[PDB]
Amino acid sequence: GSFVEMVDNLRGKSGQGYYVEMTVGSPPQTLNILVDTGSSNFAVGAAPHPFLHRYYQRQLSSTYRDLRKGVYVPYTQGKWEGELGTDLVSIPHGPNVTVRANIAAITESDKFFINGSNWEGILGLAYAEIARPDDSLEPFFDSLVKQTHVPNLFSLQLCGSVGGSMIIGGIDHSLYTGSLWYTPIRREWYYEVIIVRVEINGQDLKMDCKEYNYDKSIVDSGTTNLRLPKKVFEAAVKSIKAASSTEFPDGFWLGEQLVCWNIFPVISLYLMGEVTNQSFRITILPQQYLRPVDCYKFAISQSSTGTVMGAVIMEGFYVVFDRARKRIGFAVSACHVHDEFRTAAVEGPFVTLDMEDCGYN
Ligand SMILES: COc1cccc(-c2cccc([C@@H]3C[C@@H]3c3cc(=O)n(C)c(N)n3)c2)c1
Known part of the structure; x- marks a missing residue:
């Protein structure tokens, strides 16, 4: 009924969508992550693209696990592609839990990151049916509910x-x-x-x-x-x-x-x-x-x-x-x-x- 720690946990720029702060890996790496109810992958910058304030550095995370599988996501002008793995994820201004989630480490992109934006990734909150490469890649929210009492x-x-x-x-x-x-x-x-x-x-x-x-x-x-x-x-x-x-x-x-x-x-x-x-x-x-x-x-x-x-x-x-x-x-x-x-x-x-x-x- 009341969740004061979560109120006002979104920021953004007009026309550019809303982002939440998240952490990935151990020790935690902070990123700003776009909240997207229209897709189902959790995907984050993992390389020094010149528009990025910061990016996931898998080499620094003791809890990182490689899935040894690529993912390629073209959409409408235009694209992101990455390397699948898992790691520990939390939402500092969300529930007091940490979960092991699928993470696409973005290694190539086109028209994805925005010059001058302050976000480094995307949180797909929709269902497995539209996850890529396919519905066996468990979405973040599915993992959250499965691993906790949220x-x-x-x-x-x-x-x-x-x-x-x-x-x-x-x-x-x-x-x-x-x-x-x-x-x-x-x-x-x-x-x-x-x-x-x-x-x-x-x-x-x-x-x-x-x-x-x-x-x-x-x-x-x-x-x-x-x-x-x-x-x-x-x-x-x-x-x-x-x-x-x-x-x-x-x-x-x-x-x-x-x-x-x-x-x-x-x-x-x-x-x-x-x-x-x-x-x-x-x-x-x-x-x-x-x-x-x-x-x-x-x-x-x-x-x-x-x-x-x-x-x-x-x-x-x-x-x-x-x-x-x-x-x-x-x-x-x-x-x-x-x-x-x-x-x-x-x-x-x-x-x-x-x-x-x-x-x-
Ligand atoms: C415009 O504001 C936002 C807010 C949240 C996410 C995005 C966003 C921007 C670029 C790419 C993507 C991912 C391809 C996924 C995607 C494609 C897409 O075409 N739509 C409409 C949505 N909702 N998601 C998502 C954009």
Whole structure:
């Protein structure tokens, strides 16, 4: 219910994701590690790349064990690759435990480390199914729960240098107001969920809900934007365009250029609820989808791999990754940025029929 040592354990830079301090090896080596609910590998710099403040030096760790296996991870502009092993890992501002975890020692990369960033690795918090090389490489959180008494859940309050909290093993009730509302984790690979309805300023998009989840919807701390399937993004922008016709170029809506609150509509996503024919809705503000760069980028964008509820969504809410119950809880975040008129919201219950049809097969 209360985990004060873990509050404010996240830092970062806008558009660059949130990191937690971790230690690896014996004696402990401190690194800053990006928190990513959209992947499942724990991977750290292990060589003196010129952008790195520091890196894992396996030769200094008495507890290091080599797995003698490579791992190669290309993603979308572009890549990291490394050497697998295990070692002792802890989170100084997390639970008072140390575990033996898989660690990919990064030995080559492309467009991975960021010039001027203050992080040296990534913590994939999603499930084994999407671990590389394959699902037999146990993810860090799986190892943590297996080797300790840490409950099988964590929660995130991303506040928007930005700050936030990762509560490992529980929920901190001071981080949210009102009630938590839960949506099922559809399948344990990404943190996959089902959107059953979309409103802009209360106006339904009238789209076949199946489109909202084409070909999936995921909750992803490792993505800045709210990302939507093109068909959905088209209707979204058309509506976001109309709502704000009162006062911007076409390239803006495409993230091709920048522009320098009440004119802009709220966005509600209704999520599948816990009960048959029952849903709830989460509502965000322009302050969430208009992120400082007073020049802002439009932080809603299009996708070929489905809806991605990135930091734009998550900074509105306290998000509970209730792995034990295969569900994700949303509540209004106690730190979310609002004005005096409108506030981010989590509301229910609503009656929504045929919600099962919204999931793509
Ligand atoms: C933008 O902020 C963040 C926050 C946390 C992690 C990352 C991040 C940056 C570059 C690479 C990666 C790893 C390839 C994994 C990855 C790829 C990827 O495309 N996404 C969307 C996510 N969430 N993770 C992760 C980026």
